Design an enzyme around this catalytic site. Sequence first.
Site, PDB file in Angstrom:
ATOM      1  CE1 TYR A  52      22.192  -0.962 -27.687  1.00 51.29           C
ATOM      2  CE2 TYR A  52      24.186  -1.297 -26.398  1.00 51.29           C
ATOM      3  CZ  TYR A  52      23.293  -0.442 -27.033  1.00 51.29           C
ATOM      4  OH  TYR A  52      23.466   0.911 -27.022  1.00 51.29           O
ATOM      5  CG  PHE A  93      32.175  -0.268 -34.989  1.00 47.89           C
ATOM      6  CD1 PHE A  93      30.823  -0.042 -34.770  1.00 47.89           C
ATOM      7  CD2 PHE A  93      32.585  -1.550 -35.317  1.00 47.89           C
ATOM      8  CE1 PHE A  93      29.907  -1.075 -34.876  1.00 47.89           C
ATOM      9  CE2 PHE A  93      31.667  -2.583 -35.412  1.00 47.89           C
ATOM     10  CZ  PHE A  93      30.330  -2.342 -35.197  1.00 47.89           C
TER      11      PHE A  93
END
EC number: 2.3.1.-
Lengths: 391, 391, 391, 391
Positions: free
Chosen positions: D119, D391
């Site tokens: 990322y 999450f």
Amino acid sequence: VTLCSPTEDDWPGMFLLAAASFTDFIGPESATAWRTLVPTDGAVVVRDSEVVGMALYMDLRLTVPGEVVLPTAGLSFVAVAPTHRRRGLLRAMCAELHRRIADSGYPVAALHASEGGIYGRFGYGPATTLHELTVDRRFARFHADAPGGSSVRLVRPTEHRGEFEAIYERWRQQVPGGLLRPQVLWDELLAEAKAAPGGDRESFALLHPDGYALYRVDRTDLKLARVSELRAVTADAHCALWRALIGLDSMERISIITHPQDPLPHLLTDTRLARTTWRQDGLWLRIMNVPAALEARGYAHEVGEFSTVLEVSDGGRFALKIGDGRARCTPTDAAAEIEMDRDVLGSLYLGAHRASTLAAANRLRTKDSQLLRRLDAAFASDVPVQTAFEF
Amino acid sequence: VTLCSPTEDDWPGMFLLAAASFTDFIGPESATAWRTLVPTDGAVVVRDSEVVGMALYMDLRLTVPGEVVLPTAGLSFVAVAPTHRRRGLLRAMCAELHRRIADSGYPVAALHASEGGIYGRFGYGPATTLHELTVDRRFARFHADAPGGSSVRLVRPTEHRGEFEAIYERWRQQVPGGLLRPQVLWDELLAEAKAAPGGDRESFALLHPDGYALYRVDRTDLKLARVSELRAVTADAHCALWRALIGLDSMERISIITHPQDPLPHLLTDTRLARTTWRQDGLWLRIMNVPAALEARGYAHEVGEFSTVLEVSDGGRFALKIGDGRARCTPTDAAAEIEMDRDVLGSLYLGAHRASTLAAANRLRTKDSQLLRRLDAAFASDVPVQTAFEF
Amino acid sequence: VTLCSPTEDDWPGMFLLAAASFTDFIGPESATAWRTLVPTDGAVVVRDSEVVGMALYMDLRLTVPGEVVLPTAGLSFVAVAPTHRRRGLLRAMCAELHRRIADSGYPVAALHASEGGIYGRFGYGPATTLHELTVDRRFARFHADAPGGSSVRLVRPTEHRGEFEAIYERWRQQVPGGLLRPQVLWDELLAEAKAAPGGDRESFALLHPDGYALYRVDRTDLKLARVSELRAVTADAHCALWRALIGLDSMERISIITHPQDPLPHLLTDTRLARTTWRQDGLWLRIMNVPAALEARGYAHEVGEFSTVLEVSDGGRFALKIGDGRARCTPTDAAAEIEMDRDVLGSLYLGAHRASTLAAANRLRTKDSQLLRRLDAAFASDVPVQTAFEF
Amino acid sequence: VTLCSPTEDDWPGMFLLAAASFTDFIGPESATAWRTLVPTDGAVVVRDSEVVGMALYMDLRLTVPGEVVLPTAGLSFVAVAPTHRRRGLLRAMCAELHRRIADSGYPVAALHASEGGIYGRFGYGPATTLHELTVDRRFARFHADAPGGSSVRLVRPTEHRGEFEAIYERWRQQVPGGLLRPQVLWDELLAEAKAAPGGDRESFALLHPDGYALYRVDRTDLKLARVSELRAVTADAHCALWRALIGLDSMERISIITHPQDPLPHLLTDTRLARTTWRQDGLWLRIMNVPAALEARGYAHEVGEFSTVLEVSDGGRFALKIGDGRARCTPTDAAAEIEMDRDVLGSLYLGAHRASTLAAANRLRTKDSQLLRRLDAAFASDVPVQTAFEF
Ligand SMILES: [Cl-]
Ligand SMILES: [Cl-]
Ligand SMILES: [Cl-]
Ligand SMILES: [Cl-]
């Protein structure tokens, strides 16, 4: 202690013995499904009254070299109660089933062995080799030469039963060791595909027009994917399925129980990444009728016509003539040129073991080294021998 | 960065690079002994001045199918400094040594690979297979058929050098993969036979007229005996040595690094007791001169005379005619029937890998399945390929 | 039980107690070398006559924030005989050495703790943090931004002593936690660089003009290189040394005991590859003279001038004024605004622990949250605190 | 291959990809609950027709230094099919979601990374640090200074939902890294609190007016209690909850995934008993709008007013003025004094990483060491950064 074909009332007692004997017992519901493959008079029990011994065979179809399909007696569900060891119950049950199998006209019997030391003395030889490959997929790069540098879909197994059935049917007919997989075993296989509470994780499928792989993440090692089954009818399908499996980026390792000639290692720039982590005997064969079995399979066309005299220890002596890929095997009292126990012929029969290797262990006796080379060449299989499904 | 043959003054710098590169570095005294096998101009170094790269070859004699002995360039002592990675030093050193090896008239080069992913691109194919068998000897019973149900003596290795030398010399001449073991390597082998403080335990020998086994108890696992070397010229010697090893009653397990066709498992009533615990590429081959290598080895007599056209990627195209166990391999511009990279020919050359298996990975390209079967049969070795000693 | 400075005749008895107390005891020859750092009256022993207790301090030079070098009493060789536990021998020996250290004019004492629960009660606080990073170097790729995409040489440590001494001397003067390394400790360090029979493997060095790394392959894990020491005076040197260490292609893993702010993880495309495998207290500090220690170190220039009243439990109460990176610390009877035990001040002193964190554990008491923020900021070190060498 | 917002009919295909991609897949029922946090046009899918790629974001509220709450795009449920690797599907999906997130007016995006190497290239920097502490509670004694030497109750989580909700809401508003926990995530959390057959053991809660701990005994290690969540609004609550956890007398060890500044170790007489057993990146941040993000958070009051010019690589150049705890960040073409990639600003933003440390890795470029010190001080967080929920 009497030996009988079981009545319907015997099966609860057989299921108790099974549960106590087999840690992998499939339970009464699945066992009742497998029962549908057992012919009338396919089962024996020993009663003391409770069941203290049992054995049965199922009607199978086994592919042998030359794409020939033989009717095969698949021995299974063999147990002696821990209360009745060393009483000759296994010997008595095996003698009776072999009598029934031989009289029924089966040329071969087959089994998967719980231990390696038991079935040799009953004439069974290990005939296929299980080869576990573990790939560290984090390092795996496909060779420049590897096919198909997608044709593959990630699917739910239960939604593509027709496609798996059709691919498997093509595979089993072209590969020595192939078994016909009846509808009840497809029912059972797809029931095991779903996750179980505290049990196996969900199974997934990779589907190609000419192959499939069924895999699941290991229960406890969450970085290991285990391929339960990969059936590929073409080299393109085999490579395409492995490109997809190496694409399981959440895994460190992919493992498969395959055969010694799996081309997987040669698809990679580093052949060493496909590590052999386990090797074991797979399918065992007892040749029931020597001439029928030997005449039935195809032989290598490369070897020139030759004749010999084969003696199977308490299995007959035969004039064996092999030429143009076919054998003729007729009774003779001529001097034997080759001698071996019945189990040894089973080990040679699908091409998994070389006559030369068995000769070096004196399991196969001849004074002619040229004859040994001709047997090695003739009995060799063009298509490598594979293991279909355990029974 | 210059590439030179090392001077005497370069060798201390080469020994530092070796110590930092190889956890199994034999030290300067042993390395100076191995140096005696390196010809004039057999070594290259890269200087920045300190040694940041090195590579050499030794003069070896390799047995190939048909008991033919080839002069062989054994690549060894290959290292790039951790300070000089990704600078093309390995490529430059390999290019120069290959030039020297080819010009010197070697038909083949060979090495043992530190990793599986490096040497394929330089034309090396894995040509032998290391197969570790571990026997739980507490359960091991010899088969009724096993030879010699003593001819074997428990001896100190250093006291029977002449007998080991003579047995090994017979073995290496009859087995593909066999290497001549020069006097300096016998000196080194018998020096390692003694125990070391905090190091290896004492080595023992089992001596038969036609075979020997060298073994030692494992440093840390005191219930494991490791066989470093078993050389048997007859089946009787092989079985007799294994009867003696299974007689090591203080051990739970005997392990050996052997070959895939070792008949050991077939000597036992339970074949499964000889467990495959490890498998790896052994000797790697680079065919330097395609026609010289292909004409030099013997081929299977069983396969009928056949002709084809073989192309080696940037290695030439040849009319290949194989009949009566011999090959003729001549230049042609005729259309290729078979194509493969040079590394693939190395993998086929000692019979350790089947043409069919390499074809399934598309490492070997042909449109003729009959030609593939003929190549499989022809390149197959009567005597199973073994690995001699690591270099 | 009497407490005395040892005579020459006491040292054999001290070496016996050491051998029985310390599994890492360096032996009498090395211990005699370390003795040269112990001043006259630097050692105490308890006799029962045999030695049942001992403790000493060495004359050290410790770098604190602002590149200030303090004379430091390094406590070491502390042992109570297993026959004499729970008799207050440690308390008696620590009380006497602290008296001698305080009277001698040392502003600080320091030690490395055998256990974490012992030295807090004697006023020692953990002041540096050991952070073990393990890199899986097979995956490690340097970031596009990383310096120097060679300046580094692979060398024998014993041949470059002058260069290591000079680099270390530059490092220790600019880093809080830095210790002067006297000639006897260089003698000892380079003696440990060679391999030992059944002991450590050979040490290697990576040498840059502005840094070095000393490393060795682990005794038992042959795929692990342990960096014993990396001293880099520039970011370029630090990155260059790590490029070389990641170039150790025979290793799977490189481990180093470093500090929490080591920039290594930020040099890689995957920061997660530099895994924290271990964390522990390193150097412990006892502030002997509160005003001398607090006035001696530099403070952060970023925080505006502020005044407070600090009470150290049984260590005095002081008006503390911090501005322009300097502290003035004078006696007062004014109401305390901050209270803490002596050990807590040691933990704050090199900037390894935040006042705010210690306040959250109620080890530091104040009613002013603004004062807490100012202390956090002021006591923070510009140059991250590191651990020099264990003593 | 087309990229679309999914229709209702796409979600079964997304759940199949999820099950095959995520070993921790929560199943369709829980996933349907999490779906309620995904806005209209919050999701993208790639179809080949079956789902071969997916990605979405949820509407979150993230607390940043100064107790400022930012609307945050929480990226989640990101998967590419193993059949479709190396086809730029991740790049295409991330580009489209970032376009939607930026156009929607989100100043920041956030995620939890499956791997550390992915990322960074999409502008995400690791912004919080997970720190696992394992306490051997058999040895743990509270320090004389530790608060509260009971206010705590052992309760069933499902019976005290209102109290946990209220404590968590207070916690998340005062701690950088805090997330609003919507009602659907409380529903899910308390459903996981009960035991599962062959799965997790029953969860218990320790409840204080100003804090709670949720814990369960480990599935397999029955002497390990794992704290899934400890939220304490006061130091008294934090200490009281830890006194209760150390009171779990049937356990050897208590483990918690906490933050690097957890004061737990300082509550004990032996700080070493709170062992760091694991460390990893937690929340990752992509700053979507540089001036909006930089103006939104509070800065340290201790640092004096200063001005600089910051360039974000392909993210703009800004005149940055920081004074009295606030930033002004306006467009400029003036020469840059600081340069960094977008990911680096994310890593600085919650105060988890020092500008000085990133500068040492050359991830942050400046020629002014004073500017570096001012940035370190200004971006530092008074309240230590914590991780809320995954999450
Ligand atoms: Cl198979
Ligand atoms: Cl071998
Ligand atoms: Cl350090
Ligand atoms: Cl946290």
